[PDB]
């Protein structure tokens, strides 16, 4: 059961904490969705290999440039998050987060994760974005960014409906093992 460290990065409203909670609980929290995520050591067996994956979050650290990097030491896989209902969060990926991750975590694989894929086919979400000359992030836009930034992968998921959440973390375990 080799130990690997995963860190999730991204803008405040990208839904990274929600993703980490839904995976660890393995259930959409019926009564209360927590505000914070402390840590968790997931028992994962991907492709016949048993790995303990420590799950970490940078939520709350986004404005503190000398506090945030203290989460990066010994990272094995970085999950770069962005919201599908927020096209400006994807624009921030190559010019804010990517230079920083590649500096503190050299040679650590990065997986581009587009959260909230459910909102891509949501009425109120497409309506709000149209009132700012915009639309939700398209699949090819996320894939193009993942290629442009030199990511290992591009994946999509919906933390609310649970679609694709298990596979993000099984692929992350695989990337960490390379």
């Amino acid at each position: 059961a080799i130990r690997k460290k995963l860190v999730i990065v991204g803008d405040g409203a990208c839904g990274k904490t929600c993703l980490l909670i839904v995976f660890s609980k393995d259930q959409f929290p019926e009564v209360y969705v927590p505000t914070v995520f402390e840590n968790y050591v997931a028992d994962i067996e991907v492709d016949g290999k048993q790995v303990e994956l420590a799950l970490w979050d940078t939520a709350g650290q986004e404005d503190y440039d000398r506090l945030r990097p203290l989460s990066y030491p010994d990272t094995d896989v970085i999950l770069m998050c962005f919201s599908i209902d927020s096209p400006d969060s994807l624009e921030n990926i190559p010019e804010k987060w990517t230079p920083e991750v590649k500096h503190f975590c050299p040679n650590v694989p990065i997986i581009l994760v587009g959260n909230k894929k459910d909102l891509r086919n949501d009425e109120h979400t497409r309506r709000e974005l149209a009132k700012m000359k915009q639309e939700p992030v398209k699949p090819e836009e996320g894939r193009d960014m993942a290629n442009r930034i030199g990511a290992f992968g591009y994946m999509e998921c919906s933390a609310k409906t649970k679609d694709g959440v298990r596979e993000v973390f099984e692929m992350a375990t695989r990337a960490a093992l390379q």
């Binding site: 009564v31 927590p34 505000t35 840590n39 970490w56 709350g60 503190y64 000398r66 030491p73």
Partner: protein, 244 residues
């Protein structure tokens, strides 16, 4: 942590912690505010539990069972005693505020109406200056501690057998020497996430809304001061490297 407080905070939310006949008596907005307040005390109890692991299990265990200098043990767990006294006192006032809010003839049904005054006291004056000074020191010695742990574990057999032994029980899964150090470092940044969500559901009493509004500015000013005084320490870093 003690068994009384673990059972009081065993539930996933305040709506599960209280008796269902007592929950029914309240508005939707009150339950929402109380769920977020319960999360603050529950995560503070876990934070204090983490610091008691670092001092009682890791720090003292190494002092009483291993043969390394006390300067080596100090390099591993900087400011743990100073932090443990700061957070145990904060927890003490949070748990007392909850106890005074309990109904007569009950040990689970409570409603915390005033929290802002408690957070204004903690995040201002000498208690805020002692957290600013302790976190600036801890987070600067953070990377130095991890390298000392990695060096020790990879070079001492007795340290390896101590660590493998004390971190063997299932309940210590998330609490290693390195996870404890990061758990402490990340805690300060959790307060403005919790205080803003309590503030989101505390618009009913205007006095509470303004107290939480002030408490949130106090936390952000403290976080800005801790962040501005951080400079990573390196073991055997020359004087020329530091002024470059």
């Amino acid at each position: 942590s003690m068994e009384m407080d673990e059972k009081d905070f065993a539930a996933d939310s305040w709506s599960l912690a209280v008796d269902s006949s007592f929950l029914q008596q309240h508005k939707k907005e009150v339950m929402k505010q109380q769920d977020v307040i319960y999360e603050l005390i529950q995560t503070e109890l876990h934070h204090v539990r983490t610091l008691k692991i670092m001092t009682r299990l890791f720090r003292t265990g190494m002092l009483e069972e291993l043969h390394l200098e006390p300067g080596v043990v100090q390099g591993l767990f900087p400011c743990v005693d100073e932090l443990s006294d700061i957070h145990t006192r904060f927890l003490s006032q949070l748990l007392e505020r909850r106890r005074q809010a309990l109904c007569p003839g009950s040990t689970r049904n409570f409603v915390i109406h005033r929290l802002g005054d408690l957070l204004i006291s903690q995040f201002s004056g000498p208690s805020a200056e002692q957290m600013c000074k302790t976190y600036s020191e801890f987070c600067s010695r953070h990377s130095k501690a991890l390298k000392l742990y990695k060096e020790l574990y990879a070079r001492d057999k007795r340290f390896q057998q101590f660590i493998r032994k004390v971190t063997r029980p299932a309940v210590l899964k998330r609490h290693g020497v390195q996870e404890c150090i990061l758990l402490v470092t990340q805690r300060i940044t959790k307060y403005p996430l919790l205080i803003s969500r309590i503030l989101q559901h505390s618009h009913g009493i205007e006095e509470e809304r303004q107290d939480l509004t002030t408490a949130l500015g106090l936390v952000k000013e403290l976080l800005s001061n801790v962040d501005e005084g951080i400079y990573q320490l390196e073991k055997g870093a020359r004087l020329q490297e530091i002024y470059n």
